[PDB]
Short mmCIF file of C-alpha atoms in Angstrom, two decimals:
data_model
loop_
_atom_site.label_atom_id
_atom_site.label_comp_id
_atom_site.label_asym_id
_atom_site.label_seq_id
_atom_site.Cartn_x
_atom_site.Cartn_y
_atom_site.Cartn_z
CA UNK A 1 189.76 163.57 94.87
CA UNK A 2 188.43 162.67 90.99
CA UNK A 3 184.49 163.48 90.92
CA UNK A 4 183.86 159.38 90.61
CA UNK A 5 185.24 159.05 94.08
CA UNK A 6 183.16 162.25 95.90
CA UNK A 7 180.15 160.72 93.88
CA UNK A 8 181.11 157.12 95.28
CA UNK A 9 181.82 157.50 98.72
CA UNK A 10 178.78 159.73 98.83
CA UNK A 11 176.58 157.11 97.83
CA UNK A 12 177.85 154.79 100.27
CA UNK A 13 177.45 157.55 103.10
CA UNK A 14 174.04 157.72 102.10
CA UNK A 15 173.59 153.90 101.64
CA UNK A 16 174.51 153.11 105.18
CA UNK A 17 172.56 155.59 106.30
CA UNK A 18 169.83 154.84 105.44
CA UNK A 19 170.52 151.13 106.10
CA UNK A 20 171.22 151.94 109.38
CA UNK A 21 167.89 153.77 109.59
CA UNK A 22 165.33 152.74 108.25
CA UNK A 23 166.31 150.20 105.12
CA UNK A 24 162.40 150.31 103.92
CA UNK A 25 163.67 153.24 102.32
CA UNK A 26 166.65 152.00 100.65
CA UNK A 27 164.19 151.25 97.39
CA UNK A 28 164.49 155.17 96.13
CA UNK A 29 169.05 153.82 95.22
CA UNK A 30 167.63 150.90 93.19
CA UNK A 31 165.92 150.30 90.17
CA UNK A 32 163.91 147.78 88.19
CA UNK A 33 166.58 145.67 86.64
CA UNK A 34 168.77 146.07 89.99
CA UNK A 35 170.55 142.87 90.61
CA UNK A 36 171.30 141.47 94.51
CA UNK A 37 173.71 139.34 95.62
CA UNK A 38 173.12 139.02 99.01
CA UNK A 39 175.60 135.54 100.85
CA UNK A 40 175.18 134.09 97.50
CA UNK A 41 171.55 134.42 97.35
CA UNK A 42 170.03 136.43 94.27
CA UNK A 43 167.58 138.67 94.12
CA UNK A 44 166.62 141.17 90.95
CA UNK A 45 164.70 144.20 90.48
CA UNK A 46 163.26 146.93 93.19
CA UNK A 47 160.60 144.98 95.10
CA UNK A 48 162.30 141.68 95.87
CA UNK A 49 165.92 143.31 97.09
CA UNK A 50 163.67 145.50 99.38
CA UNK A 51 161.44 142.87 100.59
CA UNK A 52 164.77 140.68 101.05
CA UNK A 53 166.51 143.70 102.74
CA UNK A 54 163.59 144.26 104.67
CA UNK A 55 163.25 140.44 106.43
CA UNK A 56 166.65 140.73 108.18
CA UNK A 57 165.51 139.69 111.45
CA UNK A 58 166.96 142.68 113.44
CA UNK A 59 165.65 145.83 114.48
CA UNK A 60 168.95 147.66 115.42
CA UNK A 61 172.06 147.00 112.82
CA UNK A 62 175.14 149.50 112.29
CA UNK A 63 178.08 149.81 110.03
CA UNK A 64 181.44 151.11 110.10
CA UNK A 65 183.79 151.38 106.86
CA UNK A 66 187.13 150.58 107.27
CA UNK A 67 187.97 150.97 103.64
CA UNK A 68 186.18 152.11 100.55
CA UNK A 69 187.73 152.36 96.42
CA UNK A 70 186.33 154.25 94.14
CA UNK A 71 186.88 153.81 89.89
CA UNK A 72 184.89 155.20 86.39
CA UNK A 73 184.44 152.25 83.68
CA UNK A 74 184.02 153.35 80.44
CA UNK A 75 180.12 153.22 80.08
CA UNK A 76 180.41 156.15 83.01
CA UNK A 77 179.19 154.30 85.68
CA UNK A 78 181.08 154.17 89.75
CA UNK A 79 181.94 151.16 90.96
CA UNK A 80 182.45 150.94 94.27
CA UNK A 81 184.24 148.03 97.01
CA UNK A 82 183.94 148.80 100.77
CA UNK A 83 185.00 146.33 103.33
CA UNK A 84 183.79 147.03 106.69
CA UNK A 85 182.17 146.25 110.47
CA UNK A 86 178.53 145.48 111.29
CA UNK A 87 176.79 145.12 114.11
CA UNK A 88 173.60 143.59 114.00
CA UNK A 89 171.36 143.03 116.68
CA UNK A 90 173.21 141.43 119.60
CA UNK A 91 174.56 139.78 117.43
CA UNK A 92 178.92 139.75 117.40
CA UNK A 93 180.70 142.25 115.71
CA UNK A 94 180.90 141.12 111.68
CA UNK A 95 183.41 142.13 108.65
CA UNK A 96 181.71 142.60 105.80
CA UNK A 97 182.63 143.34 101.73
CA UNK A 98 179.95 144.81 99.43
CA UNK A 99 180.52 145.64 95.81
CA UNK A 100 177.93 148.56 94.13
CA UNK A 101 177.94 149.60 90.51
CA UNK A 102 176.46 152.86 90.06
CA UNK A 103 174.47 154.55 86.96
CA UNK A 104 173.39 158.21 86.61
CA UNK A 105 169.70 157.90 85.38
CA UNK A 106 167.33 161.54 85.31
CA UNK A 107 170.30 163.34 87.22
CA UNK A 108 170.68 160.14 89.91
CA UNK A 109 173.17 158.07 90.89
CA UNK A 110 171.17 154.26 91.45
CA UNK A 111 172.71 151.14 91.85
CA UNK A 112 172.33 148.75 89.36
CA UNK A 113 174.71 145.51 90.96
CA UNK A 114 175.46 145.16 94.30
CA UNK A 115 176.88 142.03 96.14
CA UNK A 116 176.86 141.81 99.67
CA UNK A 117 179.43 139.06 101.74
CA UNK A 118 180.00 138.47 105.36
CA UNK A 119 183.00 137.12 107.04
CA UNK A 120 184.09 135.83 110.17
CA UNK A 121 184.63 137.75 113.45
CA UNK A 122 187.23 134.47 114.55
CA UNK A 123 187.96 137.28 117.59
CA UNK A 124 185.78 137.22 120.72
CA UNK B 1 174.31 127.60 84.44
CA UNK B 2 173.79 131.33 82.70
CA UNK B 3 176.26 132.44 79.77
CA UNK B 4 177.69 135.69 82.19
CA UNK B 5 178.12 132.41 85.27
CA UNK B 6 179.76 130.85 82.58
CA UNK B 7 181.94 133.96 81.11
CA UNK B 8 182.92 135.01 84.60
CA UNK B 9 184.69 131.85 86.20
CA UNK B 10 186.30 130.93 83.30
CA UNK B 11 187.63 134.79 82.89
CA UNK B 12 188.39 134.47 86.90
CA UNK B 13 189.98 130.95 86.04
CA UNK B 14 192.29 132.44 83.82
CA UNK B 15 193.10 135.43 85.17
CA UNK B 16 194.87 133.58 88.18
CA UNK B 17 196.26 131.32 86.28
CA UNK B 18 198.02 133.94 84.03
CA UNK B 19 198.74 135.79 87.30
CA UNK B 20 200.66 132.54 89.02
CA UNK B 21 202.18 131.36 86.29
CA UNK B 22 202.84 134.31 83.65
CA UNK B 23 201.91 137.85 84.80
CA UNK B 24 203.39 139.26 81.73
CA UNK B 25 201.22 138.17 79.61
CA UNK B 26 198.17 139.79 81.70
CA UNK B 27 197.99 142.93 80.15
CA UNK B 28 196.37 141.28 77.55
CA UNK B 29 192.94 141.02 79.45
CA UNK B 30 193.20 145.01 79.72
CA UNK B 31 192.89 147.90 77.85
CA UNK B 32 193.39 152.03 78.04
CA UNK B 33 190.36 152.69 80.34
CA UNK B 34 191.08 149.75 82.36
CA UNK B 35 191.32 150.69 86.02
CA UNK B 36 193.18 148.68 89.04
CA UNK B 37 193.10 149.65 92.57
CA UNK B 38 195.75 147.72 93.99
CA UNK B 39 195.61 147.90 98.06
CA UNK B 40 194.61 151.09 97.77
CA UNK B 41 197.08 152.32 95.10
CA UNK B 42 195.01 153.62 92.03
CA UNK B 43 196.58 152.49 88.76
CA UNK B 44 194.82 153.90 85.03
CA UNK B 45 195.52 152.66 82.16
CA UNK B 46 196.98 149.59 80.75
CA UNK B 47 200.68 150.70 80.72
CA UNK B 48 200.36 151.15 84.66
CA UNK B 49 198.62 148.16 85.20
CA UNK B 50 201.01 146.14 83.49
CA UNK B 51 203.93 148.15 85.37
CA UNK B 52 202.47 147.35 88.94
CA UNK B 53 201.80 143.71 88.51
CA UNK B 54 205.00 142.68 87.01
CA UNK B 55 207.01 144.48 89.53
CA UNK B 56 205.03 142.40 92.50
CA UNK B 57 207.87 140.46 94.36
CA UNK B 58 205.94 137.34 93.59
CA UNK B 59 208.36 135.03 92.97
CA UNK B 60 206.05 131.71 93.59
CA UNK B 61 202.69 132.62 94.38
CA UNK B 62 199.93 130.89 94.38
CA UNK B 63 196.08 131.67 94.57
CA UNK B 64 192.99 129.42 95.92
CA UNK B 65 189.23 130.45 95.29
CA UNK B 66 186.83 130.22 98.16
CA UNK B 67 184.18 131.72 96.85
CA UNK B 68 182.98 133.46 93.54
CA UNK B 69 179.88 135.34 92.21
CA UNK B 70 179.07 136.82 88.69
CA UNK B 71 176.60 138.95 87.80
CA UNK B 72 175.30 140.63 84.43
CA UNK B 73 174.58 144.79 84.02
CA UNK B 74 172.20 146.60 82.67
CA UNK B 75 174.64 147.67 79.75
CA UNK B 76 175.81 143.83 79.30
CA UNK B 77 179.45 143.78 80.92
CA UNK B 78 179.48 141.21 84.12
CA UNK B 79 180.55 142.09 87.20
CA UNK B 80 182.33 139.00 89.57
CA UNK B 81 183.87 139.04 92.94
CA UNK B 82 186.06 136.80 94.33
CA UNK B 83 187.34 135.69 98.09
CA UNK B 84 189.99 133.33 98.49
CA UNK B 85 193.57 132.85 99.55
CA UNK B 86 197.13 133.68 98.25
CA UNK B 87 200.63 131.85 99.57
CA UNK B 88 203.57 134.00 97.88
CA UNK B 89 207.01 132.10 98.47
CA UNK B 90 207.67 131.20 102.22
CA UNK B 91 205.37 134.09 103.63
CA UNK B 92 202.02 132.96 105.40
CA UNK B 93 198.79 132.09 104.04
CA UNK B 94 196.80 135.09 103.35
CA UNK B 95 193.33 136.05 102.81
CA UNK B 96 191.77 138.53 99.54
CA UNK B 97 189.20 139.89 98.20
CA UNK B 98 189.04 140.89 94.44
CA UNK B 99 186.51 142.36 92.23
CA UNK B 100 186.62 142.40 87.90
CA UNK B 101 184.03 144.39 85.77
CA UNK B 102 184.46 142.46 82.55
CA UNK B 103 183.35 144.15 78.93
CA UNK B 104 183.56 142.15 75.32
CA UNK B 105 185.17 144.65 73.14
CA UNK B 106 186.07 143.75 69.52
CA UNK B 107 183.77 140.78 70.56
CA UNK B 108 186.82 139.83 73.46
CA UNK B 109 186.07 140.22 76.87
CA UNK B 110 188.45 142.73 78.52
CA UNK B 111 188.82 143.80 82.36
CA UNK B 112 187.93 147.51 82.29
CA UNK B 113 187.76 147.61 86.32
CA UNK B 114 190.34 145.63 89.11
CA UNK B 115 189.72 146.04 92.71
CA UNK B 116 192.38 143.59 94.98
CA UNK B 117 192.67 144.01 99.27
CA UNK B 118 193.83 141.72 101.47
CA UNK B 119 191.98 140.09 104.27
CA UNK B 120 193.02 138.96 107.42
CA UNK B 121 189.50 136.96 108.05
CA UNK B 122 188.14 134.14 105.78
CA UNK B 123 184.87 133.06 104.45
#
């Protein structure tokens, strides 16, 4: 596996991790001039992704990845596409697709972009 | 609407219609570094890119946009994703989701990244 794909699915490992968590934490993989695209609803910088992160109205959410691709672009950034299952309160089962765009800044891989769309369970 | 709104529908625009009406003439939109990650098949370089989406047994295909979003980076390329559908000759309506880092080079904006999966749920 090229290094841009161990440093990619590693941040989405982490990511969801913490996500699944506790996502008051998630602040430390974003920076100032982070941009949010969250069901067509943006959001920039630090602060205001956390805060909108933060207001999801459950307490309990998990994800699964069913599929995750990795690729370099030529200003050495990651950019990442998973498409996956979450479960969010009681809510039903959910596909999702997110899209992050990775940077190495002081010896740290933070997201700069990252766009965030749910689907349609249509089953159950 | 934004200049990088503005940049990245009309590159998405174009790229589909080049795509379902003359794929040939899309390897125009990419250069060396440009990566696509076809269904899971990794493809580098414009030579390969070309090769893989030329060979697609398209032989009338056809895509619709359901939804788009752009967005600019930090080192000025834009970054748009895209869910919609594709019909490809008799076969069944089917769902997609694709995703295009875009970077002007010799003041032209280029695809440098490609990311297409299907999708058997909508939006």
């Amino acid at each position: 596996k090229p290094i841009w794909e161990q440093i990619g699915s590693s941040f989405i490992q982490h990511y969801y991790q913490l996500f699944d968590n506790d996502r008051t934490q998630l602040g430390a993989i974003y920076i100032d001039a982070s941009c949010l695209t969250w069901e067509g609803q943006q959001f920039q910088g630090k602060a205001a992704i956390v805060e909108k992160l933060s207001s999801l109205p459950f307490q309990k959410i998990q994800h699964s990845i069913t599929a995750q691709d990795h690729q370099p672009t030529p200003d050495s950034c990651i950019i990442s596409m998973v498409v996956g299952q979450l479960k969010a309160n009681e809510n039903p089962i959910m596909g999702f697709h997110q899209m992050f765009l990775l940077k190495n800044i002081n010896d740290a891989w933070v997201c700069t972009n990252d766009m965030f769309r749910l689907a349609l369970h249509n089953f159950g």
